[PDB]
Short mmCIF file of C-alpha atoms in Angstrom, two decimals:
data_model
loop_
_atom_site.label_atom_id
_atom_site.label_comp_id
_atom_site.label_asym_id
_atom_site.label_seq_id
_atom_site.Cartn_x
_atom_site.Cartn_y
_atom_site.Cartn_z
CA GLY A 18 118.39 89.48 105.85
CA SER A 19 118.28 93.47 105.56
CA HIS A 20 120.76 96.17 104.79
CA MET A 21 119.29 99.29 105.69
CA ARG A 22 121.66 102.72 104.85
CA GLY A 23 120.92 106.08 105.94
CA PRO A 24 117.68 107.92 107.63
CA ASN A 25 114.05 107.05 107.05
CA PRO A 26 113.08 108.10 103.52
CA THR A 27 110.67 110.98 102.48
CA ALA A 28 109.17 112.11 99.50
CA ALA A 29 111.11 115.31 99.52
CA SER A 30 114.13 113.66 99.96
CA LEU A 31 114.24 111.25 97.52
CA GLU A 32 112.94 114.04 94.65
CA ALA A 33 116.24 116.28 95.57
CA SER A 34 118.61 116.36 93.18
CA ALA A 35 121.12 114.95 96.03
CA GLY A 36 120.31 111.78 98.93
CA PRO A 37 122.20 112.16 101.94
CA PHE A 38 125.43 110.30 101.43
CA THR A 39 128.51 112.43 99.91
CA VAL A 40 129.83 111.22 96.99
CA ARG A 41 133.02 111.03 94.91
CA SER A 42 133.74 108.93 91.64
CA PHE A 43 136.83 107.98 89.29
CA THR A 44 137.27 107.21 85.86
CA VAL A 45 138.78 103.16 85.68
CA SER A 46 141.89 103.22 84.46
CA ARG A 47 141.81 100.04 82.39
CA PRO A 48 137.97 98.83 81.72
CA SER A 49 138.22 95.29 81.32
CA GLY A 50 135.69 94.06 79.00
CA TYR A 51 133.72 97.24 78.35
CA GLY A 52 134.61 100.33 76.42
CA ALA A 53 134.94 103.05 79.78
CA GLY A 54 133.51 103.41 83.05
CA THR A 55 133.01 105.88 85.66
CA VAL A 56 132.21 104.90 89.14
CA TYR A 57 130.16 106.96 91.58
CA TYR A 58 130.24 105.84 95.20
CA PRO A 59 129.25 107.32 98.76
CA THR A 60 132.20 108.20 101.24
CA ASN A 61 130.33 107.95 104.38
CA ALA A 62 127.10 104.88 104.06
CA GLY A 63 128.03 103.70 107.17
CA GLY A 64 128.23 100.05 105.85
CA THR A 65 129.10 98.26 102.64
CA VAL A 66 126.44 98.88 99.75
CA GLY A 67 125.28 97.11 96.91
CA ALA A 68 126.74 97.99 93.29
CA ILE A 69 124.50 99.23 89.98
CA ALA A 70 125.72 98.75 86.55
CA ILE A 71 124.16 101.15 84.19
CA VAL A 72 124.85 100.71 79.97
CA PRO A 73 123.51 103.47 77.74
CA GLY A 74 121.60 102.90 74.41
CA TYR A 75 122.91 101.96 70.28
CA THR A 76 124.78 104.78 69.63
CA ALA A 77 125.23 106.44 72.83
CA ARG A 78 127.40 107.14 75.35
CA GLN A 79 127.93 107.49 79.04
CA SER A 80 126.53 111.30 79.34
CA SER A 81 123.00 109.82 78.22
CA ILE A 82 122.42 108.01 81.85
CA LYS A 83 125.18 110.06 83.83
CA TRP A 84 122.40 111.80 85.86
CA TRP A 85 122.12 108.43 87.47
CA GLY A 86 125.36 107.65 89.22
CA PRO A 87 125.39 110.87 91.62
CA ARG A 88 121.91 110.14 92.01
CA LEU A 89 121.71 106.34 93.30
CA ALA A 90 124.96 106.82 94.89
CA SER A 91 124.21 109.41 97.36
CA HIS A 92 121.48 107.26 98.92
CA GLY A 93 124.07 104.24 99.05
CA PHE A 94 125.07 102.66 96.06
CA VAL A 95 128.46 102.13 94.10
CA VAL A 96 127.16 102.88 91.24
CA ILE A 97 129.49 102.09 87.45
CA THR A 98 128.14 103.77 84.03
CA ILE A 99 129.77 102.73 81.24
CA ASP A 100 130.64 102.78 77.37
CA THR A 101 130.06 100.02 75.69
CA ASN A 102 133.57 98.88 73.18
CA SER A 103 131.04 99.97 70.40
CA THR A 104 128.35 102.34 70.22
CA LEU A 105 126.92 100.02 67.79
CA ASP A 106 126.80 96.87 70.25
CA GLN A 107 123.63 95.06 70.19
CA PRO A 108 121.77 93.80 73.51
CA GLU A 109 123.37 90.29 74.17
CA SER A 110 126.60 92.12 73.68
CA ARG A 111 125.97 94.63 75.92
CA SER A 112 124.65 91.97 78.67
CA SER A 113 128.37 90.49 78.74
CA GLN A 114 129.70 94.13 78.99
CA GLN A 115 127.58 95.16 82.19
CA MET A 116 127.87 91.80 83.72
CA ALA A 117 131.83 92.66 83.22
CA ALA A 118 131.54 96.20 85.01
CA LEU A 119 130.22 94.53 87.73
CA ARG A 120 132.88 91.97 87.79
CA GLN A 121 135.25 94.89 87.76
CA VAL A 122 133.41 96.57 90.35
CA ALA A 123 133.77 93.25 92.59
CA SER A 124 137.54 93.42 91.77
CA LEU A 125 138.48 96.91 92.54
CA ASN A 126 136.06 95.85 96.25
CA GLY A 127 139.49 93.90 96.97
CA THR A 128 142.16 96.18 96.14
CA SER A 129 143.61 97.97 98.69
CA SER A 130 144.63 100.84 96.74
CA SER A 131 141.32 101.57 95.03
CA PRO A 132 138.45 104.21 96.29
CA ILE A 133 136.10 101.96 97.15
CA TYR A 134 138.38 99.20 98.88
CA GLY A 135 135.75 97.00 100.96
CA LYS A 136 132.74 99.63 100.35
CA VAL A 137 131.07 97.09 98.10
CA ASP A 138 128.88 94.30 98.92
CA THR A 139 129.48 92.06 96.21
CA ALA A 140 126.49 89.32 97.04
CA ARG A 141 124.45 92.47 96.01
CA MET A 142 124.08 93.70 92.58
CA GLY A 143 121.80 95.42 89.92
CA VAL A 144 121.57 96.19 86.37
CA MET A 145 119.74 99.29 84.67
CA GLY A 146 119.99 100.58 81.32
CA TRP A 147 118.32 102.15 78.08
CA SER A 148 116.87 101.36 74.95
CA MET A 149 119.34 98.66 73.72
CA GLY A 150 121.16 98.36 77.47
CA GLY A 151 117.63 98.27 78.81
CA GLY A 152 117.55 95.12 76.82
CA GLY A 153 120.89 94.58 77.77
CA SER A 154 119.99 94.60 81.30
CA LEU A 155 116.77 92.24 81.31
CA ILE A 156 118.91 89.64 79.38
CA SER A 157 121.12 90.03 82.49
CA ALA A 158 118.52 89.46 84.61
CA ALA A 159 117.41 86.61 82.64
CA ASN A 160 120.89 85.12 82.83
CA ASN A 161 121.51 85.90 86.27
CA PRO A 162 118.53 85.71 88.75
CA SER A 163 121.14 86.09 92.15
CA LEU A 164 120.86 89.56 90.73
CA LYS A 165 118.67 91.42 93.05
CA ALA A 166 117.10 94.38 91.33
CA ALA A 167 116.62 95.62 87.53
CA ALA A 168 115.43 99.18 86.29
CA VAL A 169 115.54 99.74 82.45
CA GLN A 170 114.21 103.20 80.45
CA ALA A 171 112.84 102.42 77.30
CA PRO A 172 114.05 98.93 76.69
CA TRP A 173 114.27 97.13 73.53
CA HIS A 174 115.57 93.68 72.15
CA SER A 175 114.72 91.43 69.40
CA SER A 176 112.47 89.19 72.09
CA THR A 177 109.78 90.61 74.19
CA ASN A 178 109.85 87.17 75.95
CA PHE A 179 111.29 88.19 79.33
CA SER A 180 109.14 85.33 80.76
CA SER A 181 111.99 83.68 83.04
CA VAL A 182 113.20 86.72 84.74
CA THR A 183 112.87 86.11 88.74
CA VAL A 184 114.66 89.52 89.12
CA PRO A 185 112.46 92.45 90.69
CA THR A 186 112.22 94.29 87.79
CA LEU A 187 111.01 98.30 87.38
CA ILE A 188 110.23 99.56 83.73
CA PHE A 189 110.34 103.09 82.82
CA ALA A 190 108.58 103.69 79.41
CA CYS A 191 108.54 106.56 77.22
CA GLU A 192 104.60 107.68 76.40
CA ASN A 193 105.51 108.73 73.00
CA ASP A 194 108.41 107.25 71.93
CA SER A 195 109.26 106.61 68.14
CA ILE A 196 112.66 104.35 68.76
CA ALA A 197 111.20 101.28 70.87
CA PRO A 198 107.20 102.35 70.69
CA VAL A 199 106.16 101.38 74.37
CA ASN A 200 102.74 99.16 73.01
CA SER A 201 105.09 97.09 70.81
CA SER A 202 108.10 96.83 73.37
CA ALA A 203 107.84 97.94 76.86
CA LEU A 204 104.81 96.87 77.47
CA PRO A 205 104.85 93.39 75.97
CA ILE A 206 108.42 93.07 77.82
CA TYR A 207 106.64 93.91 81.20
CA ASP A 208 103.25 91.87 80.42
CA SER A 209 105.93 88.55 80.03
CA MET A 210 107.48 88.56 83.43
CA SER A 211 105.10 86.39 85.75
CA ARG A 212 107.29 85.13 88.11
CA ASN A 213 108.68 88.61 89.85
CA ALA A 214 108.03 91.31 91.57
CA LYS A 215 107.61 94.30 88.59
CA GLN A 216 106.27 97.86 87.88
CA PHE A 217 105.80 99.84 84.86
CA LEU A 218 105.58 103.52 84.51
CA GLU A 219 105.09 105.24 81.36
CA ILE A 220 105.96 109.02 81.19
CA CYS A 221 103.75 111.07 80.46
CA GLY A 222 104.31 112.62 76.70
CA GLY A 223 107.45 111.75 76.74
CA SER A 224 110.14 110.84 73.93
CA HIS A 225 112.80 107.83 73.63
CA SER A 226 115.29 110.16 75.92
CA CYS A 227 112.79 110.83 78.51
CA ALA A 228 114.27 109.30 81.47
CA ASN A 229 118.24 110.37 80.24
CA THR A 230 120.51 112.86 81.81
CA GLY A 231 119.11 116.52 81.83
CA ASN A 232 115.24 115.44 81.89
CA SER A 233 112.22 117.23 83.04
CA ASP A 234 111.14 114.11 85.36
CA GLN A 235 114.25 113.64 87.54
CA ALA A 236 112.17 114.11 90.82
CA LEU A 237 109.68 111.54 90.03
CA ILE A 238 112.10 109.05 87.99
CA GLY A 239 115.08 109.86 90.41
CA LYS A 240 112.50 109.15 93.11
CA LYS A 241 110.97 105.67 91.83
CA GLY A 242 114.47 104.34 90.79
CA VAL A 243 116.47 105.21 94.23
CA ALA A 244 113.31 103.37 95.93
CA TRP A 245 113.10 100.48 93.51
CA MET A 246 116.52 99.46 94.27
CA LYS A 247 116.50 100.54 98.20
CA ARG A 248 113.91 98.55 98.45
CA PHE A 249 115.19 94.91 96.84
CA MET A 250 118.78 95.16 96.82
CA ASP A 251 118.58 96.72 100.56
CA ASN A 252 115.58 94.46 101.14
CA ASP A 253 114.94 97.97 103.12
CA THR A 254 111.42 97.89 103.82
CA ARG A 255 111.03 101.44 104.72
CA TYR A 256 110.86 101.56 100.76
CA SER A 257 108.48 99.52 100.26
CA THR A 258 105.44 101.60 99.75
CA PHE A 259 107.59 104.49 97.32
CA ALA A 260 108.61 101.33 95.48
CA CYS A 261 104.97 99.68 95.23
CA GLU A 262 102.45 102.19 95.23
CA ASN A 263 101.05 104.42 91.93
CA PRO A 264 102.15 107.81 92.23
CA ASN A 265 98.55 108.62 90.91
CA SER A 266 100.43 111.44 88.75
CA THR A 267 99.43 113.33 86.34
CA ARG A 268 103.30 113.05 85.00
CA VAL A 269 102.12 109.38 84.55
CA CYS A 270 100.18 107.98 81.81
CA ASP A 271 99.81 104.49 82.82
CA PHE A 272 101.38 102.87 85.97
CA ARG A 273 100.95 98.77 86.64
CA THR A 274 102.81 96.95 88.92
CA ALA A 275 102.74 93.21 90.21
CA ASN A 276 104.05 91.05 93.14
CA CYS A 277 104.81 94.25 94.89
CA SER A 278 103.59 94.08 98.71
CA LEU A 279 103.03 97.35 100.66
#
């Protein structure tokens, strides 16, 4: 049950600012259940692709996480980046809004006038987010085990207990995070999860925004992010080593993985 799109990956191709597919985007005219949305999609993936909803953190907007949209879409995903109803929404409300964005992407997939009409496999969905939107993504995964993958950056929630998550979950953490300190937030989140494929990659010297638009590790962070979603959303074993391996990089101060074969 593989869903392979595009050429065989290399380090160079996964590190580049763009993957193989040409990307277009549009603003959602009437966002249903969230504040605002931009959809990024490939014109030419050669088959239906999975969908990914990305949520920013507390006080933040789409600009903080926007770089993910073209980056993921160019490798064969429909990506929606959202603004929340309020910038001060808490994680549980961010999760609801993320799932509302995925719902609306599935609806647009069925709308003949939509630029993504027939482009989405609505059975294959994934969640991403930063900080409270990272917590929101983990709540989405806990609540909706049919989700195929989760990739979060510097996640925070009021509980670190995500022991019920069965969804393959990648956590980017930022070593010098002063907002959601790694050793009391991202790490115990990672450690709580015992039923899934999971990975933890802490960015050496990173502040809270170390995985946000314009960061200096887009080659590595982008490569790992794309590999993870390709491996788990497309069941694409051409990506098993990129997704599961320790990069052994001086850009990473801590790396952990479990239940991640090849």
